[PDB]
Amino acid sequence: KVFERCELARTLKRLGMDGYRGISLANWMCLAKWESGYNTRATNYNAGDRSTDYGIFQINSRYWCNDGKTPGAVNACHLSCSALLQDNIADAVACAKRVARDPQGIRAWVAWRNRCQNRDVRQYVQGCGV
């Protein structure tokens, strides 16, 4: 499913993402925008280390979910990577919360550092009523 901007913003707020571990809603929106374009079925294979990025937040199979073909991988969210490809984003959100709980926080996603850090991210939630 490809979410529309505000539709996603409202969904994330309802799922308790606003201010989760100090991360504002607009930051999660910026992250979702640059990682997948708000697309829940997006997948990305990393030829270099044999891991795959799954779903709306492009969560990595090496540490977060299990896809069975990634070498020396762990499953911190204790989920099949398949769960991160559903239209319903509840599981993807619960796993994103787990990633943020780590020492790096939102910084765990390099894309966030490149496209969101120290930027005016208000635009991602403006006009959405959240």
| Residue 20, C-beta contacts closer than 8 angstroms, at least 6 positions apart | 28, 97, 100
The third-level CATH classification (topology) of the domain covering 1-130 is Lysozyme (1.10.530)
Query: Residue 99, CB half-sphere, CA atoms under 13 Å: how many?
Result: 25
**Which two tokens mark 91?**
């599981």
Experimental method: X-ray
Structure tokens at 46: 């990393």
Resolution (A): 1.8
Choosing from 4, 18, 53, 120, which is the catalytic residue? 53
7 counts as catalytic: no
Tokens matching residue 76: 């911190």
Enumerate the domain spans of the chain: 1-130
Q: What are phi and psi of 97, to 5 degrees?
A: -65, -40
Q: From the candidates 4, 7, 18, 35, give the one annotated as an active-site residue.
A: 35
